[PDB]
């Protein structure tokens, strides 16, 4: 399969710098032209850098440029992206794509991202919080307090997933929190517990907390 | 810099209709000795990185259905989807892949039309557990209502909270067509001890009265 795998991000201080790579397999890599793109938290797409299949030629818009330098090792199969100088806009998810040959050109073959996020604040485990009420009954699970991103939050191991709302994770005051919901029957709960099973990577945190009516 | 603006920003669809999804460039996107437009579009499924969709303005990519038809030169192109289904749910991107900088349109989102749904709404009092650390947070939500417009007040003790709020909406649900979305009300323990009755309501266009949810201590 032609696959592009990106690895690196992480949060980095401002004005600091981090070194991202992709790796490439299933295709003669020096025989093309290979970008890096970001989406940004408001899933806007901006174009980060262009190399030629060389290494000879480069470029960049003006946000990065002077910042940010792309390199090819072409006998290792791989793309690297330094960038220095990090400002709170360059957080994102970043990817690395294939200029298409044919002159078909464009990003290909994209892969699943590496998240970078700059900022001042510093990693902050979850408070996982049961929301129990005082056909059927809505349970909750609030997670509020961690940084970076992500958390992974799943009901009963992953048995439960219909009737199961996660809200996207929102950033206040430089911490983000994260709800979810799950409606079962009444029968289902309090009888069968509920957990939810939050995972907090940065912070090495597992929680695995049951819905208690007290 | 190329400007790329796409139109709409969000589009209602029936399965089953012929959808157009415009994308002006400010600058011709035409080669003249190429003979070709340097459009590519890019569609970008929930949780996934966009896919090549068509280049050329017109030409497609492998394993693209027929029913996507790209159109145009110069500066206006189409996207046009014969008869849309639920699997064609995405942002859709419009791309300058003529001169640098390389630039992107805005994209072009498409939800699936279905019939309104009032919201289901739960109010939750702070844990105990979270009493602890000096905070108290209310959580309200409001499930699986459509059309998405919705308007969410706090009330404490009758009068109206707007600060500590923090609001987060889920996508379209891909089961059922519906939206949801989390309202959360953060205090300290200490206002929250001193009143007795806390009020999520909300406006939705399913309801002339306001759906209201409300404790009491």
């Known amino acids: 399969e032609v696959q592009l795998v990106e690895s690196g991000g992480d949060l980095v201080k401002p004005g600091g710098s981090l070194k991202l790579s992709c790796a490439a397999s299933?295709?003669?890599?020096?025989?093309?032209?290979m970008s890096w793109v970001r989406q940004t938290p408001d899933k806007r797409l901006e174009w980060v850098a262009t190399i030629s299949n060389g290494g000879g030629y480069t470029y960049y818009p003006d946000s990065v440029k002077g910042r940010f330098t792309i390199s090819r090792d072409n006998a290792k199969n791989t793309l690297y992206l330094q960038m220095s100088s990090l400002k709170s806009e360059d957080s994102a998810m970043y990817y690395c794509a294939r200029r298409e040959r044919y002159d078909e050109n464009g990003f290909a073959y994209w892969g699943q991202g590496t998240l970078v996020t700059v900022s001042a604040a510093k990693t902050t485990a979850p408070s996982v919080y049961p929301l129990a009420p005082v056909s059927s009954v809505t349970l909750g699970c609030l997670v509020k307090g961690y940084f970076p991103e992500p958390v992974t939050l799943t009901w009963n191991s992953g048995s439960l997933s219909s009737g199961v709302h996660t809200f996207p994770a929102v950033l206040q005051s430089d911490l983000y929190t994260l709800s979810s919901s799950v409606t079962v029957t009444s029968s289902t709960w309090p009888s069968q517990s509920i957990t939810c099973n939050v995972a907090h990577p940065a912070s090495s945190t597992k929680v695995d907390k049951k819905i208690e009516p007290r | 810099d190329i400007v790329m603006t796409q139109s709409p920003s969000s589009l209602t669809v029936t399965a089953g209709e012929k959808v157009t999804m415009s994308c002006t460039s400010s600058?011709?996107?035409?080669?003249?000795?190429?003979?070709?437009?340097?459009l590519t579009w890019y569609q970008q499924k929930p949780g996934q990185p966009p896919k090549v969709l068509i280049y050329?303005?017109?030409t497609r990519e492998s394993g693209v259905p027929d029913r996507f038809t790209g159109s145009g030169s110069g500066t206006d192109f189409t996207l046009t989807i014969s008869s849309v289904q639920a699997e064609d749910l995405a942002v859709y991107y419009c791309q300058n892949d003529y001169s640098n900088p390389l630039t992107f349109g805005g994209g072009t989102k498409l939800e699936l039309k279905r019939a309104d749904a009032a919201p289901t709404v739960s109010i939750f009092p702070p844990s105990s557990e979270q009493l602890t650390s000096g905070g108290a947070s209310v959580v309200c939500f409001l499930n699986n209502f459509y059309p998405k417009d919705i308007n969410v007040k706090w009330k404490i003790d009758g009068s109206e909270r707007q600060n500590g709020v923090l609001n987060s909406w889920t996508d379209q649900d891909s089961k059922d067509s519906t939206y949801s979305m989390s309202s959360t009300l953060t205090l300290t323990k200490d206002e929250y001890e001193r009143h007795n009755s806390y009020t999520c309501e909300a406006t939705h266009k399913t309801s002339t009265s306001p759906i209201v949810k409300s404790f009491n201590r």
């Open positions: 600058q011709s996107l035409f080669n003249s000795g190429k003979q070709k437009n340097y």
């Open positions: 299933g295709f003669s890599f020096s025989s093309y032209g």
């Open positions: 050329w303005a017109s």
